[PDB]
């Protein structure tokens, strides 16, 4: 047992784990179409420069999970990064659309995330997902979803 | 249903309208308050110049309940703002008081929203409240409440 | 009867106090609209900072009528400020359409209320409507005007 | 009864007189390490100007709670200060050792008020411990923490 | 025995530990007045910006004569700080009349720490009272003194 | 076939593949290490900082090579990237030693890549590989090959 570990919980401890490689999964999905857009026969380069760097952001999610995890006496356990599921897309509609619906699918694991620390009674960890996490998932798909729109009114 | 509504109710939306329309009819109270100051047979100009200070920052509240409407994916519906009470004021002790009334039932409107979040589990609501709302409405009743008592001692 | 009160008839202060509750419906109109193109499947946000600024600008000219009583010796008597008649318009132009009629029915009012003043021979009465209120008028009309026809040659 | 005071308890009060007498005990802890060290058969000054910063800053968090006790309407009363459990120390690193303990009462007794606040209700006073205390309780754990480890590598 | 302990008696050493206890004691007083004018039914905080310096200097004397005893080659002992003798206070006047009461307190004990240290031949020690201490109990009764005449003409 | 594409062969395209997955897999070795210096009980911060910054590095390495694929009319194909072998490290010897394996195994696979190059007579992709990637891991390995013989000298 570590000599800082204090109210922390296996359970909780765990479900950190499973959210670092949610966060690198998605900065590899972001990487993947951010080069489908600097092809030769696609040639959108405000797209291209758009993807990298969400890609980049999202890398610093993770690691700001994994200075919580050492922070808090737990141990990190690293799992293999799934290669995304579609190598080219159809347009730039088509690359937008998927990834608010991947911005769906991480805020979703963060809310019982959240319903997990408030059931083991550690007030640490709920204000570090309030603080940190919760308000830029909001900002994040509140942006996607009105490119989605501005990118159907011109076919 | 909107593209972005995610872990949002229905009855959290429609209190998220009558905290509008409260902090709408709480801006054009401290309006009519300047302007009583303002006139002829009264003639204090640092109570005219304090109200209508308050009466701009109770604005800014209203319009940042209005850009959280939209954000989460709710509908906005306005309705009538009613006249105030007080047509005019009997001195300035009268109206740092009747103030200090107005801003107890705001902020005692601001508990029940809390409480109605917290009972259908909507994290990103709660911790809306508690950054922005709770900790001015604690710091202006502290504000108030020391003024009603200097203009006592002076009769 | 104030100590500062001549040359200020009964009837053209009852009329200063109809324009106040005119400029505090129109202020509340355009913000309505903010918030329209502020939505997610709307998301024009050229609209929605033009109309935030019309409605910031409308409140200074009711204040500006509040100033005017007070300085003349009148009393201000506030009323309600209703809800707009539309919740959610149809496009961009159709906005700027009602925008239009909007500004017509402020203009016709100030018209009336110079013939008044002229009646009753109020010379201060009639030079604060010519210098401020009767020249904005024409300015937004003729820039309204020209955004409608804009906006009917991109369909 | 105050005019400030809504929605605070009884309770709530007398737990937060707890905390300040417990803030001023660990100030005077620190100070008298940090003479420890000033000594002629001791003198490790990087260690006697550590602890007399770890003295101030735990005195503001003391004040932090006696001006939130004035501003929600409570009375503060304040007690005996007890002299420390021991007058010198073996070396540097059974002080490091004895600090860790410390803070880890400190931190244990902030989770007991938070409990205390949920329990009746007070989102108020949760927040203002999760912004404040909670979260370099954290970070000082855990850099005294890897100090301990340092000075038992040196021997 | 030290090995920088020369003409150091250990009556002189006993009774420079007393005046450590007293000059903390003195300082947690004046805080304690600090946080009475900070209440929302006093709300004088020319008053509470008074004292809160006034502790802050209290404890620098502290330290001085802390620093003294190990310069010397003495040995430190702390004592429990007893809580102040008043709660509340009736007014302003009865707090600076209370506070010259101690100040004249803290003045009387100099005076035999003085005549303690004539008495064992111990020039280093009498110059660093006279140097330090003596010279700044005059200037503040001095300054208290007349505070508390020109709060009686005030009624 | 692509517009671009000339004198670019299908083996050679394939063999491009597989060194970004290679650079992919070293970036998260690199992260692995960072946190694991970065925990309580290790607590070596010159060697959290200096392999976090590696792990930048071998990023932009393979950045490079998916801006290559595309500028010569190749298409990228994304695997998995496996967990790396070890989850915790003896000490900081052990962690230089294993990261000298690795670059010693990069540089060999680079190596069969120009010898493939020159066998399907491409000058292009062959000062591609010699201008970037060889010289950077000759200057690496002799930089990582110095350090582990002052870490024998240290015990």
Same mark, same amino acid.
């Given at each position: 047992?570590?000599?800082?570990?204090?109210?922390?919980?296996?359970?909780?401890?765990?479900?950190?784990?499973?959210?670092?490689?949610?966060?690198?999964?998605?900065?590899?999905?972001?990487?993947?179409?951010?080069?489908?857009?600097?092809?030769?026969? @696609?040639?959108?380069?405000?797209?291209?420069?758009?993807?990298?760097?969400?890609?980049?952001?999202?890398?610093?999610?993770?690691?700001?999970?994994?200075?919580?995890?050492?922070?808090?006496?737990?141990?990190?356990?690293?799992?293999?990064?799934?290669?995304?599921?579609?190598?080219?897309?159809?347009?730039?509609?088509?690359?937008?659309?998927?990834?608010?619906?991947?911005?769906?699918?991480?805020?979703?694991?963060?809310?019982?995330?959240?319903?997990?620390?408030?059931?083991?009674?550690?007030?640490?960890?709920?204000?570090?997902?309030?603080?940190?996490?919760?308000?830029?998932? @909001?900002?994040?798909?509140?942006?996607?979803?009105?490119?989605?729109?501005?990118?159907?009114?011109?076919?």
């Amino acid at each position: 047992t570590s000599q800082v570990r204090q109210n922390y919980h296996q359970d909780s401890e765990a479900a950190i784990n499973r959210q670092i490689n949610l966060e690198l999964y998605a900065s590899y999905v972001y990487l993947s179409m951010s080069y489908y857009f600097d092809r030769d026969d @696609v040639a959108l380069k405000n797209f291209a420069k758009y993807f990298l760097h969400q890609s980049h952001e999202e890398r610093e999610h993770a690691e700001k999970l994994m200075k919580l995890q050492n922070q808090r006496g737990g141990r990190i356990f690293l799992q293999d990064i799934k290669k995304p599921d579609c190598d080219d897309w159809e347009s730039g509609l088509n690359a937008m659309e998927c990834a608010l619906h991947l911005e769906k699918n991480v805020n979703q694991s963060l809310l019982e995330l959240h319903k997990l620390a408030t059931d083991k009674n550690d007030p640490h960890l709920c204000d570090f997902i309030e603080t940190h996490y919760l308000n830029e998932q @909001v900002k994040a798909i509140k942006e996607l979803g009105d490119h989605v729109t501005n990118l159907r009114k011109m076919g």
